[PDB]
Amino acid sequence: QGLMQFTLPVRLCKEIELFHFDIGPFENMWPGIFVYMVHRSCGTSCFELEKLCRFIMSVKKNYRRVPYHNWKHAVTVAHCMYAILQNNHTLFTDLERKGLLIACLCHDLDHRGFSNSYLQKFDHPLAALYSTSTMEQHHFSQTVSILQLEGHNIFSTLSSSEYEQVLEIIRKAIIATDLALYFGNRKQLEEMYQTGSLNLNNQSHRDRVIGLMMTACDLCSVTKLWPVTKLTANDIYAEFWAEGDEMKKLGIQPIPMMDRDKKDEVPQGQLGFYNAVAIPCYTTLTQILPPTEPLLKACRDNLSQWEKVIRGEE
Numbered sequence: 302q303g304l305m306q307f308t309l310p311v312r313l314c315k316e317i318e319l320f321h322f323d324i325g326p327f328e329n330m331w332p333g334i335f336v337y338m339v340h341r342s343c344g345t346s347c348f349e350l351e352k353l354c355r356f357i358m359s360v361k362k363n364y365r366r367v368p369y370h371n372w373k374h375a376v377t378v379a380h381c382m383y384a385i386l387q388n389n390h391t392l393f394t395d396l397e398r399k400g401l402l403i404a405c406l407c408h409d410l411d412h413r414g415f416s417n418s419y420l421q422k423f424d425h426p427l428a429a430l431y432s433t434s435t436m437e438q439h440h441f442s443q444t445v446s447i448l449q450l451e452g453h454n455i456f457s458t459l460s461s462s463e464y465e466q467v468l469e470i471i472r473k474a475i476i477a478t479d480l481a482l483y484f485g486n487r488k489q490l491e492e493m494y495q496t497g498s499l500n501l502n503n504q505s506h507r508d509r510v511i512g513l514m515m516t517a518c519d520l521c522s523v524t525k526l527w528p529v530t531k532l533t534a535n536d537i538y539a540e541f542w543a544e545g546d547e548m549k550k551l552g553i554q555p556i557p558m559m560d561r562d563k564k565d566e567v568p569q570g571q572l573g574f575y576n577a578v579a580i581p582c583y584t585t586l587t588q589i590l591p592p593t594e595p596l597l598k599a600c601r602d603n604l605s606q607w608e609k610v611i612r613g614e615e
């Protein structure tokens with residue numbers, strides 16, 4: 302009988318319920334922040350704590366020391382999904398809520414800071430094992446691996462068929478973080494909502510809405526207060542530019558997003574992205590799940606902050 306709660310300090314206990322929460326620069330608190338989120342989202346009974354803790358720590362170990370796709374990203378993306386699940390209490394099964402916080406913390410396992418594009422032009426062995434969504438099939442592969450280490454099976458009290466449902470929600474959730482897949486997924490959801498045929502009882506439909514949720518959580522840097530958003534931009538471009546450096550070494554002109562000699566275009570490159578991906582993403586999500594409106598508001602605040610960078614007012 303487990304009378305053992307995690308409690309956070311007052312400021313965190315209050316801020317962590319808000320969508321724009323920043324998990325802070327103290328790495329050693331991030332595991333307690335995740336367990337706290339599982340317990341409130343899912344219950345104290347969801348996972349054997351010894352097993353949960355061991356799993357968290359093996360996930361941490363299999364994230365690399367890159368500027369953006371790192372352990373802090375993992376925990377950030379999982380906090381966004383917690384906030385979505387907490388403002389949509391009744392819409393999700395017990396299994397989706399277990400699976401989705403895990404999917405979020407695993408979604409970029411063993412990321413090296415390179416796009417799928419660069420793996421295919423480098424001719425990386427993972428581009429032969431997996432032809433599309435290369436890094437994403439790999440992240441799911443790494444998650445099965447850690448799940449199958451001794452003491453690390455956190456679903457060990459699910460039946461054979463419940464266990465297979467959760468691993469299938471985790472798989473689809475990780476594949477959907479392939480931003481190449483998002484454009485189609487969002488248009489479909491857009492039509493389904495506007496012709497009125499979107500049904501949350503239809504598993505193929507649920508699967509699209511989770512997919513969208515995964516895109517929203519993954520991109521949640523654009524939904525933070527401006528000082529966080531802006532400082533996280535530096536880390537994103539530090540990967541993008543290292544990737545352009547590697548493209549130039551293969552003898553290919555990278556796109557300007559990856560070319561550090563084109564740092565000047567960055568504010569205009571963020572507008573493109575906010576208009577072409579982020580605003581559309583958080584728009585369709587608010588339409589399907591009205592309580593996520595604060596992600597769209599925050600996103601429109603950061604688009605307005607980037608227009609102010611261009612008009613030389615910062």
Ligand SMILES: Cc1nn(C)c(C(=O)Nc2ccn3cc(-c4ccccc4)nc3n2)c1Br
Binds near residue numbers: 567568570571573574
């Ligand atoms: C959060 C977040 N998650 N992702 C995947 C992104 C992203 O993809 N951001 C982007 C998109 C397109 N861009 C074009 C340029 C750019 C720069 C200089 C000169 C010219 C163009 N910069 C861009 N940045 C952001 Br934010």
Ligand SMILES: [Mg+2]
Binds near residue numbers: 408409436478
């Ligand atoms: Mg990813």
Ligand SMILES: [Zn+2]
Binds near residue numbers: 378
């Ligand atoms: Zn990610």
